[PDB]
Structures are given as C-alpha cells and as structure tokens.
Amino acid sequence: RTFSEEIKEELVNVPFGSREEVISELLGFIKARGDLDVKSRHIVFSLHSFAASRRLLNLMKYLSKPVSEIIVEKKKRYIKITAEYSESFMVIEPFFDVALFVSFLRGLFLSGGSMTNPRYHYHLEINLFEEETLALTRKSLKDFFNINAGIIELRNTRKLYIKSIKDILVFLEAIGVQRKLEEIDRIVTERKVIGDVNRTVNFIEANAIRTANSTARQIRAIELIKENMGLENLPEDLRRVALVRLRNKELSLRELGKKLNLTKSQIYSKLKRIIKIAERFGDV
Numbered sequence: 001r002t003f004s005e006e007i008k009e010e011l012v013n014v015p016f017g018s019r020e021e022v023i024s025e026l027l028g029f030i031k032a033r034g035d036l037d038v039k040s041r042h043i044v045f046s047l048h049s050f051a052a053s054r055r056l057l058n059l060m061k062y063l064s065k066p067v068s069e070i071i072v073e074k075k076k077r078y079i080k081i082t083a084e085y086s087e088s089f090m091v092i093e094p095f096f097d098v099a100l101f102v103s104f105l106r107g108l109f110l111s112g113g114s115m116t117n118p119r120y121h122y123h124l125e126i127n128l129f130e131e132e133t134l135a136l137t138r139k140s141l142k143d144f145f146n147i148n149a150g151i152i153e154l155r156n157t158r159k160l161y162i163k164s165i166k167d168i169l170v171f172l173e174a175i176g177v178q179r180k181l182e183e184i185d186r187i188v189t190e191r192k193v194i195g196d197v198n199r200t201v202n203f204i205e206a207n208a209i210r211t212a213n214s215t216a217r218q219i220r221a222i223e224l225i226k227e228n229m230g231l232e233n234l235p236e237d238l239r240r241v242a243l244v245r246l247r248n249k250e251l252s253l254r255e256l257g258k259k260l261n262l263t264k265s266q267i268y269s270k271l272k273r274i275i276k277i278a279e280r281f282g283d284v
C-alpha cells in the first residue's frame with residue numbers, strides 16, 4: 001500500500017465538526033475532483049483513492065443525500081461517484097474560518113492531493129484546475145498555519161506543493177492525521193546527526209596526530225638506515241622512496257607518490273617495508 005493512501009485511510013472516520021464543516025469538506029472534493037452540472041442536478045466525482053471514496057460517502061450520509069452510481073471507469077482507471085446536486089453545497093465560504101478551511105483542505109487533499117514517502121522525498125501536493133482557488137488556498141495556509149507553499153504548472157492542471165517536512169506535519173495534523181505523524185518523526189529524527197564541534201575538532205586532531213607520528217616514524221626509519229647501512233644499499237625501489245621522503249618531509253603520501261608515479265597505497269607499502277628494515281638498527 002502506498003504511503004499516501006495509508007495517510008488517507010486515517011482520515012476516513014475523522015469527526016464531522018458541523019454541517020458547515022461537512023459542506024466545506026465536500027466543496028474541497030467538488031473543487032478538486034467534481035464535474036458539476038447544476039442544470040442536470042448532478043455532481044460527477046472522479047477519485048483514484050478508495051479512502052477518498054469512502055470519506056465522500058460518509059459526508060453524503062451525514063447530509064442525508066443519495067449517491068446514485070458508483071462505477072470504475074476502465075492505474076489510470078478511477079472511481080466515478082455520481083451524487084445529487086444541492087444548492088446548499090455551494091453556499092459555504094471555505095476560507096473564512098480556520099475550522100471551515102481545515103475541512104476544505106482535508107477534502108482537497110483526499111480527492112486530488114498526495115504525499116510522498118518521506119524516506120525518499122519531502123513532498124505534499126494538491127492538484128486543482130481553478131486558479132483563484134489555489135491562490136486563496138495558498139494564502140490561507142500561510143495566514144492560518146504559517147505554511148509556505150509553491151505552485152507548479154502542468155497544462156492539464158496546476159499543483160500546490162509543500163516541501164518543508166515541518167510544514168507537512170503541521171498540515172497533516174491540522175486535517176486530522178495522528179498515528180502516521182509518529183512514523184514520519186522517527187524517519188526524520190533518524191536521518192539526523194547533531195552537533196558536537198568539540199568532537200569534530202577532536203576527530204581532526206586525532207587524524208593529524210596519526211599522520212604526524214607516521215611521518216616522523218618514516219623519517220626516523222630512513223635516518224637509521226642511512227646511518228647504519230646506507231640508502232644506496234636498499235633495493236632500488238625502496239631507495240627512491242627513502243630519498244623522496246627525506247627530501248620532502250612535509251608532503252602527504254599521495255604527493256610523495258606522484259613524484260615517483262606511485263599511488264598513495266604503493267608508496268605506503270614501501271614505507272612500511274623501510275620501517276621493517278630499520279627495526280634492525282633502532283626504535284622506529
């Protein structure tokens with residue numbers, strides 16, 4: 001089951017605050033996915049969500065309004081719900097009020113909205129044809145909940161989207177999601193790693209101390225060999241490595257390697273051999 005539909009399942013039995021909030025949520029369904037025909041007295045809803053379809057049926061039941069037909073129009077296939085038109089449906093001003101607006105948002109989201117699995121993306125969207133509706137919705141999201149949302153063009157439709165995981169949680173909780181807010185936080189909190197600047201400094205020092213102690217140990221090993229047997233009496237490939245280290249004592253192993261067409265690991269293996277040889281003569 002998609003993460004999005006799991007969120008929508010939580011909303012199927014959210015309370016019906018009042019008749020006004022019920023009609024406001026229905027208007028959300030109507031605006032997003034309703035093909036309205038006042039003359040023939042019907043509304044055709046096209047829904048890709050079963051959670052959304054069940055919520056729509058529960059709203060119509062609350063209002064005591066009959067739904068006449070439920071069919072699948074033959075992934076791209078969708079649910080067609082035909083219901084009776086009532087002028088009361090269109091009388092509500094859904095933005096005027098945070099209670100009315102939250103119900104409108106729930107309707108918009110259930111019918112035409114979706115949300116990405118936050119393990120992969122931060123994305124919650126609402127698809128809508130009308131341009132005014134989307135702008136007004138975006139303004140009310142900001143005024144009421146301080147939620148910043150962008151807008152996207154798709155020719156067939158336009159998308160309102162929220163990319164802040166903070167704003168997404170506020171949005172979801174506002175419309176009545178509960179269980180899944182905990183799962184989202186466990187995912188968000190688990191991607192995080194916080195702080196210690198002193199731990200960072202400690203780590204950087206430790207690596208620098210390792211590198212310095214190694215380099216000193218290389219130099220010391222080369223000096224002992226030079227004193228006791230002569231570098232000229234090393235195997236040719238170790239001899240060049242000993243000289244390059246001794247002549248370039250502040251270079252990294254990578255940079256020492258470049259001077260002999262050797263990789264860092266190659267020059268490092270040779271330095272280890274040189275140190276092994278120098279144990280003969282003294283502490284290294």
Ligand code: NA
Nearest residue numbers: 244247248259
């Ligand atoms: Na050199």
